[PDB]
Amino acid sequence: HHHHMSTNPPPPETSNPNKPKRQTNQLQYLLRVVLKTLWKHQFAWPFQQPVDAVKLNLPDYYKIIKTPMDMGTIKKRLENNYYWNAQECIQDFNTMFTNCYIYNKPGDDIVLMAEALEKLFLQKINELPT
Ligand SMILES: O=C(/C=C/c1ccc(O)cc1)c1ccc(O)cc1O
Ligand code: NA
Ligand code: NA
């Protein structure tokens, strides 16, 4: 079974022509302010693209994580006006952080990074437009 090597699943979709979409002030804020400041963080790098289980040598990642999400996927979704409301985008951020905590253990370097971005994310969404 040497040909059976670890592979990544297809990444989450960033467009869907049959999904209803909207452009709200809150969604514009989520891209302009929330994502674009998190994106510039020193700890942002592990979350700027889907977990590449092949490259990072984590063949068990997608055996554990069944609803993957990352800021690269969120950024593309926000830029593509993929979302209907802010809650949908916020749920994607929540999913990204929770996956990191599920897959890893408290105190891991990746977890300490996720906790730091999560606290900044909650700070930034504390006040949304309207
Ligand atoms: O970068 C890593 C993991 C990132 C990550 C991102 C999101 C998650 O939900 C879980 C892990 C990583 C993991 C193991 C390793 O040896 C070297 C590495 O660089
Ligand atoms: Na865990
Ligand atoms: Na705010």
UniProtKB/Swiss-Prot annotation:
Signal peptide extent: none
Positions of the record's site feature: Acetylated histone binding: 104
Residue(s) of cross-link: Glycyl lysine isopeptide (Lys-Gly) (interchain with G-Cter in SUMO2): 63
Occurrences of domain Bromo (ranges): 22-128
Disulphide bridges: none
Post-translational modification: Phosphorylation by CK2 disrupt the intramolecular binding between the bromo domain 2 and the NPS region and promotes binding between the NPS and the BID regions, leading to activate the protein and promote binding to acetylated histones. In absence of phosphorylation, BRD4 does not localize to p53/TP53 target gene promoters, phosphorylation promoting recruitment to p53/TP53 target promoters.
Cellular compartments annotated: Nucleus; Chromosome
Tissue and organ distribution: Ubiquitously expressed.
The family this protein is said to belong to: Belongs to the BET family.
Function field: Chromatin reader protein that recognizes and binds acetylated histones and plays a key role in transmission of epigenetic memory across cell divisions and transcription regulation. Remains associated with acetylated chromatin throughout the entire cell cycle and provides epigenetic memory for postmitotic G1 gene transcription by preserving acetylated chromatin status and maintaining high-order chromatin structure. During interphase, plays a key role in regulating the transcription of signal-inducible genes by associating with the P-TEFb complex and recruiting it to promoters.
Misc: JQ1, a thieno-triazolo-1,4-diazepine derivative, and I-BET, a benzodiazepine derivative, have been tested on tumors with success. Treatment with GSK1210151A (I-BET151, a I-BET derivative) has strong effets on mixed lineage leukemia and promotes myeloid differentiation and leukemia stem-cell depletion.
Disease implication from the record: Cornelia de Lange syndrome 6: A form of Cornelia de Lange syndrome, a clinically heterogeneous developmental disorder associated with malformations affecting multiple systems. It is characterized by facial dysmorphisms, abnormal hands and feet, growth delay, cognitive retardation, hirsutism, gastroesophageal dysfunction and cardiac, ophthalmologic and genitourinary anomalies. CDLS6 inheritance is autosomal dominant. A chromosomal aberration involving BRD4 is found in a rare, aggressive, and lethal carcinoma arising in midline organs of young people. Translocation t(15;19)(q14;p13) with NUTM1 which produces a BRD4-NUTM1 fusion protein.
Protein name (database record): Bromodomain-containing protein 4
Originating organism: Homo sapiens (Human)
Span within the parent record: 42 to 166 of 1362
